[PDB]
Design a protein around this ligand. Structure first.
Ligand SMILES: Nc1ncnc2c1ncn2[C@@H]1O[C@H](CSCC[C@H](N)C(=O)O)[C@@H](O)[C@H]1O
Ligand code: NA
Lengths: 265, 265
């Protein structure tokens, strides 16, 4: 009679919370999805070993089209868990699944876990200063999307930071690198000429948040565009004007050039 | 030889990640602060029991003025941990403590935990649609904070949602309720008269995120301003322009007036 939305966390199998783990262990059935994102620091086998139960993986179609035929039926007579990377309901379409549960007469509860939305706090950038967020999508065929560029523009214009999610082909396990994102943004700049993203733009790259050894780098595009930030996933951020405290953290902790203390503050 | 920043999560001691628990267990000394947020579902005893270590609680002054005199000295010959509610680097000034550690020759590591910043996803509002965040602070003497009002105005103008952290005076055991935040906002409105926050403004209240049955309510200020949302902590959200799916969730899950289903595209 109960469906539990449980977040897996940032990186590996130990990023789930104690509450989430214990709940997963008490559920009769455990489902998971890895189409919204992957857990780069672990494997399905390791998550299964930790939970001590077989995990049935669901595709985007299984969830988006048949959630009520695959998961909800069992949730009527058993305790069922639905695992998702990060924090449940952060993924735009998952909240509606709670409505489907209601329509089916199934109770649902949410057990949270860390999300990159809050984890970016490790970059030293003040969380309250983040504005609208966006996703950098790969252009394809005759389609060249650029709305993420406009989001950066509107945020920076108001002195806010922009959290940029990078494209991912979950099914094919293919990540867009921060390097590719920067190249794309420069191309968009050459197109729109808005003076929004250039070789002189200060950016922050966060790789493998959740790991005990994440990569946190800050610097100008001209210098970071060919830098190796390690294995994915990569998150790109375009800070607005910095608080001196933010700049000092980027210099001391993220290896940013001292120059930011006078140019970007 | 190192210092661990470990978040304890939203509500109770089990909101800590497995990673945070295992790392905390292997530390020689454990410190913590409980003034940046309120963990309404646990106590120091339960936390100590779970981690199996005695925990030394620090005041805002112990941290802000003497972190390097109380905590860092021990991290030079032992592994030390510093626990905080939610995520240690979200809506706190704790990030600067990493600079203090560095200058003291102490390497530090961060272990995330669920944060209210991402937990807002449970309201059904698209997390990427949130703009600049702000804090509703208690007036003090002749000083009456009002900047949070302008934040709402700026976000709303852009169709973005506004997350409002509410004030807290831990030493006085004072936790601002969404009701008190609404009252203050109405007073600021009478002054600035920007039509930003009125009896007709749609708001969303999230109380005790992290618990199994948090209070999630949406409606007009005139109707919610005197509603009982249960024990603290509470956060208040002023949505911008709603997507239909956001409105549907607010109505179905947060008991919002069915009339908000009719969006003015
Ligand atoms: N479980 C919870 N439910 C509702 N609001 C919460 C909350 N935890 C924190 N808050 C809100 O955030 C304020 C503390 S701000 C510190 C937040 C913390 N670092 C985190 O990551 O969550 C509180 O005064 C309250 O308004
Ligand atoms: Na945000």
């Amino acid at each position: 009679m109960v469906l539990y939305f449980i977040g897996l966390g940032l990186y590996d199998e130990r990023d789930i919370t104690v509450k989430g783990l214990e709940c997963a262990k008490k559920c009769d059935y455990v489902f998971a999805e890895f189409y919204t994102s992957l857990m780069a620091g672990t494997t399905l086998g390791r998550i299964q070993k930790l939970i001590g139960k077989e995990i049935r993986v669901l595709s985007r179609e299984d969830v988006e089209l048949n959630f009520e035929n695959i998961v909800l039926p069992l949730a009527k007579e058993n305790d069922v868990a639905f695992l998702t990377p990060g924090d449940p309901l952060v993924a735009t379409t998952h909240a509606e699944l709670r409505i489907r549960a209601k329509r089916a007469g199934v109770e649902s509860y949410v057990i949270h876990a860390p999300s990159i939305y809050s984890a970016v706090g490790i970059t030293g950038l003040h969380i309250y200063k983040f504005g609208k967020s966006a996703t950098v999508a790969y252009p394809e065929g005759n389609w060249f999307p650029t709305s993420y560029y406009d989001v950066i523009k509107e945020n920076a214009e108001r002195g806010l930071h922009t959290l940029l999610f990078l494209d991912i082909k979950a099914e094919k396990r293919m990540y867009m690198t921060a390097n590719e994102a920067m190249e794309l943004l420069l191309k968009v700049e050459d197109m729109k000429k808005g003076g929004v993203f250039t070789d002189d733009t200060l950016v922050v790259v966060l790789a493998r948040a959740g790991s005990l050894n994440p990569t946190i780098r800050a610097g100008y595009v001209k210098d970071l565009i060919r830098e190796d930030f390690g294995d994915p996933p990569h998150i790109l951020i375009v800070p607005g004007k910095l608080h001196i405290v933010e700049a000092e953290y980027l210099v001391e902790i993220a290896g940013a050039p001292r120059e930011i203390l006078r140019v970007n503050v």
